[PDB]
Each structure stands twice: as C-alpha cells, then as structure tokens.
Design a protein around this ligand. Sequence first.
Ligand SMILES: [Cl-]
Ligand SMILES: [Cl-]
Ligand SMILES: [Cl-]
Ligand SMILES: [Cl-]
Ligand SMILES: [Cl-]
Ligand SMILES: [Cl-]
Ligand SMILES: [Mg+2]
Lengths: 219, 219, 218
Amino acid sequence: AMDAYEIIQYIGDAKKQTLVKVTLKGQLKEVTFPETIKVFNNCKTGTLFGDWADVKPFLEANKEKIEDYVVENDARNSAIPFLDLKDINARIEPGALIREKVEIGDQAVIMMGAILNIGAVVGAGTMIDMGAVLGGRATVGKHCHIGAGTVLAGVIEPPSAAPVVIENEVVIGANAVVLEGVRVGEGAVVAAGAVVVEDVPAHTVVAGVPAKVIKQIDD
Amino acid sequence: NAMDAYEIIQYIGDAKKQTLVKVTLKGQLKEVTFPETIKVFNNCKTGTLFGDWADVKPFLEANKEKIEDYVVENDARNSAIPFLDLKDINARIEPGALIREKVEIGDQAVIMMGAILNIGAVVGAGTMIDMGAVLGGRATVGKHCHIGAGTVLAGVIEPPSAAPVVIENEVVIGANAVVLEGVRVGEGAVVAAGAVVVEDVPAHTVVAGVPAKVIKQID
Amino acid sequence: NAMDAYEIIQYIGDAKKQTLVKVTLKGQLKEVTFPETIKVFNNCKTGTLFGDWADVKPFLEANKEKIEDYVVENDARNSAIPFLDLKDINARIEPGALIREKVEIGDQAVIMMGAILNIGAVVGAGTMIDMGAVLGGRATVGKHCHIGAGTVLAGVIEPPSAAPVVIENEVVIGANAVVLEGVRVGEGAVVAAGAVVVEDVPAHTVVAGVPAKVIKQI
Ligand SMILES: [Cl-]
Ligand SMILES: [Cl-]
Ligand SMILES: [Cl-]
Ligand SMILES: [Cl-]
Ligand SMILES: [Cl-]
Ligand SMILES: [Cl-]
Ligand SMILES: [Mg+2]
C-alpha cells in the first residue's frame, strides 16, 4: 500500500555520486590513499574506484608520484543505483538499463536497450522488447509482450496517483505510448504506434493516435 | 542463403546462457587456486577475473579468507546470444550501438549511437542506421538507405519461412516510424516520420500516417 | 558562435577515426617492448593496455610468444567523434546516456538513462531530457523544458545555414513524439505524445496528431 511513498523516500535519501574507475601507474608505495577510495594496487600499477569528488583532489595531491592514469566514467551527479542483475531468475540482455527497486518476475525477458525506471514491475514470462521504456511505477502483468520502443509513461509523484497498469497476456506493438494511469485490460492488443489515452477493455484491439477500439477479439 | 532463417534458430538453440562478470580483487592470491572455468590475470597481490557468475560466486565464497576486497562488474543476466565482434568490420559503429552475433554490416555502413541490431539483421553498403533505431530479427536493409532515429523495423525470427522486413535500396525512413513484419519498402521510397507501415510500399512513393497511406509519387 | 554550425562541421572533418580497445593481458611482460602508440599499465606479470586496434592488433601478433593470454574490450569501430567529459558538469547525467562532444548542458539539467545527444545539441538550465530521447545535431532546447521519453528532435548538421530544431522555454513534449528539422516550438507549448510536429508551434498552444495540429490554446 505504501510502495509509492517508499519510492519517493528512497529517492530523497539517495546520495548523488560521480563514480569513476581509475587505472594508474607510478611510485604507488609512496602514495597515501584515503579511506574514501577503494584501491587495488601493487608497487607499480593500480585500479581505483570512487566518487570523482574524492578522486580528483587525490590525483592533484599525488601528481608527482603518478606517472599516468585513465579515468572511466559513465554518469554525473547520479543518485539512484542500478539493480543487481546477477541473481535474478530472468533474462536481461546487455545494454538494458534497470534502476534499483524494479521487480522482474520469473522467466521475464528484458531485451537490449530497454529502460526500466524505479518502481517498474515486470510480471512472470513477460518480454520487454528492445529499446522499450517503463516509466516510474509502470506495472506489467504476466506473459505480456511490450513491443520495441514502446513507452509506458511514468508516475512517481504524486504517490496517490495510479501508474500505468498492463494486465496479463497483453501485446503492445512497436513505438506505442500508454499514458499515465491508463489500464490495459487482459488479453488486449495495442497496435504499433498507438497512443493509448484511456483504459483498454479486456480482449479488444485498439489502434491510432489517439487509440480507439478497432475490434473485439474472441481470444 | 535459403537456409539462413533455419540456421539462425539453430544457432540460438545452441547458445549457452551466461552471467558474465569482471572481478577486480586483492588478497593472498598465491595461496588461492582458481578453477579452469575462470580466466585470471593476477599477481600474488591483486588481479582481474573473467568468468560466469555460476563459477565465480562459489569461488568467492570458497576463498573468502584469502580475498580481502573485491568489485564485481556485470551487464547481463542469463544472456545466451553473443554480441558481434566489431573490431575488423569495414564500417562505422558508434559507442552504445547494441549489435548481436550474425548481423551483417555492409561496407561503409554507419551504425549510430544507441541503435540496436538483432540477430540476422542485414545492413547494406553505405546505409545509415540512425540513433536509437531498432532492427528486429532478420530485418534486411538495402544499400544507401537512411533509417531514421528511433525507427523500428519489426523482427521475424520464427517461423523461419516468414518473410522479414525488407527495405530496398535508397530508402529514407523518418524518425520513430514503424515497419511491420514482412513488409517490403520499394526502392527509392520515402516513409514519413512516425508512420506505421502495414503493407508493401511501392518503389519511389512517399507514404505517411498511422497506418501509412500513399501520399505522393516521386519523379 | 554565429559560426557555430560551421565550426561543428570543421570539428567533425578534423576528428580522426579510431577503434579504441582496452586489453587485459598476462605473460613475460618485462621482456616485451610496448610502442609509444599504446598507453600501458603493467608489472612484470600482468598489464592493461589502452589504444587503437590498428596499433594493438599487430603488437599482439608480434608478441604472441611472450603473451600467455588476453582479453580485449571494445565498444566502437571507426568512430571519430569523441564523447563529452561529464565529470565536471553542473547537471545530472544518468548511466547509459550517450552524449557526444560539443554538446551544451546547462545548470541542473537532467539527462536520463539511454537519452542520446548528438554534436551541437544544447540543453538549457533545469531542462529534463527523458529516457530514450534523441536530440539530433544542433537541436536546441530552452530552460525548464521536459522532452518526453523516446522523443526525437530532428538533427541538422548540414547545411550549416539551416536552422536547427528550437524548443523555447517551459515546453513539455510527450513520449515518442517527433519534431522535424528547423521547427520552432513556442514558449509554454505542449506537444502531445506520439505527435509529429511538421511546422512551428505557437507559444502557449497544445498541438497533437500525425501530422500535429493545434488542439487547444493554454
Ligand atoms: Cl532473444
Ligand atoms: Cl518516469
Ligand atoms: Cl556521425
Ligand atoms: Cl526481433
Ligand atoms: Cl530521476
Ligand atoms: Cl543528427
Ligand atoms: Mg525509441
């Protein structure tokens, strides 16, 4: 019941960071590393992991002992961590971007380049296809197919607001959009390129910008 | 050739699911025995391991006494299909493009940032696949086409007898368009931004709309 | 600056294509001579190399009898345009955003995961570029805008005399919309989800549809 409130609380607690991986060489036994940097070094070479705010002044301080370095970096002032994928009972392909507090059901499939925002829920056996986007709290049922490039609009604030809810066995075409708070009924089909602005009854096909009922199917 | 779609499904059935990790660690490593299943680049002090999580996890547990600290880097979970080795291809592929094995990239093609090429996709000579575009399984693009940003060319892996999307030479497709399964877009045709193409496009015609219709013949 | 578009094209023509690799290797490395074209971090046993594949590939072959094993990491092929250093920017850029050099990101802008910013793109102060959105070459967004997930703002690199997409302040654009080349969206306008904007949008109007039309004055 308090999920949406606890998401906003988690976000407000999250600490902005600019995490870097540094490879370096030099007279590293002469170097003094602070507790703030995770360091993996021998006397000759090393690998450092840490926030740029700690690493930058560190490199400046030891410039005379460090011969050369490379800094790798992916993000800036980013607070929300990404989800640990290593133990999930599902399939997540490389280039998928999944934030913390996302729920991925058993034997779901998250394709290359899909993006799952905080609070997103993916039911068991569901495919989120390539480049698809699940906004904050967007909720997908079981054995659904969310087409390549489709956007399910996000709803973080206000926490009392209903997120997008995709019921079971839904197929949504490529590059469609489902707007905030819209419910797509069980077994329904949303055509490629549709913009779904109101609830879709179970077992109907909708299509168009904006989507209209085009057909009622018998399963 | 004629067996290509069959050979794709066979390659996928043969692919082994893996949770590849990169581990940076330190400790008493001369006292550590690494198993055959892990690639390891170490001194007696620090080191880097590449392996499947199913091997690396029980390893890290088995050697907890000797391992002082570690970091695990991971991108994918239970992913079976390898990505394409880009290094020797006679084309341009920008960072963030996600390209699976068994994709065919013609001479002097350009694959922009964030484009996603699924297994079996074919990109002809001189073609640009623009930012965030998606080529589904077996989607075939001719020579000197421009596939606009965010465009989805629908995938057809199964059944193998099904025709894929075929884009003929010199076609330009607008941003965030969709071409549905098995559709042929004729030579020199133009597809407007945001169109959903549901049936074959004649050569040298412009189509537009959701669903797309013929809007003018080009001379 | 009046020269901006010309200078972007100059910068591209000057960028050198590269196939950058990171190589982890092990072997008898004290016996190896690493050329000055490769950045090298090694002890006698193991090392890390950074360099262009054109230099690293014949180096690996020349030294195969000394190198026991290696792993090559690579991201790109024949890529010339560098990416933007994010580290000192006064803004928020999330992981997986792809942002080229000569992109301007204003104070407390937000660049969400998977957004794509091409060379010349300008993002104004307090503007959000949402997940999966694409700013084409020279696309210009004002202050306190919201560019919705999956939206494409069309690019204009050549000809340099052509106007880019210009989004004025306080604009909201819905998900998976498209703004075509040279189109100006007026202050405080709303573009509906899925719209294709083919012509200028008046300030404080709502436009919708494929092609977009005025549906409301706000
Ligand atoms: Cl797959
Ligand atoms: Cl969101
Ligand atoms: Cl380019
Ligand atoms: Cl596909
Ligand atoms: Cl955020
Ligand atoms: Cl562009
Ligand atoms: Mg997209």
